[PDB]
């Protein structure tokens, strides 16, 4: 409602997507780093993508 029709959903969905991307990778890496498992972010970002 703050932004218009062509950008209320454009960047609004992007904010949800971008925030979820960094959140999802952190939570997944949190499990593996805690257990002493080293996995590059590439293998996780592909799944999150």
């Amino acid at each position: 409602r703050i932004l218009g029709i062509p950008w209320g959903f454009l960047i609004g969905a992007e904010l949800t997507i971008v925030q979820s991307r960094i959140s999802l990778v952190n939570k997944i890496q949190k499990v593996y780093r805690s257990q002493g498992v080293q996995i590059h972010n590439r293998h996780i970002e592909i799944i999150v993508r």
């Binding site: 703050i2 932004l3 218009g4 029709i5 062509p6 950008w7 960047i11």
Partner: peptide
Amino acid sequence: KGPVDELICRIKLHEGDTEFWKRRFLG
């Protein structure tokens, strides 16, 4: 769905006005 100061005249729609939405995005 219908079968006075008429203040509706000042309700300005900015559909398609890219410059207007950029200002609100900035602040």
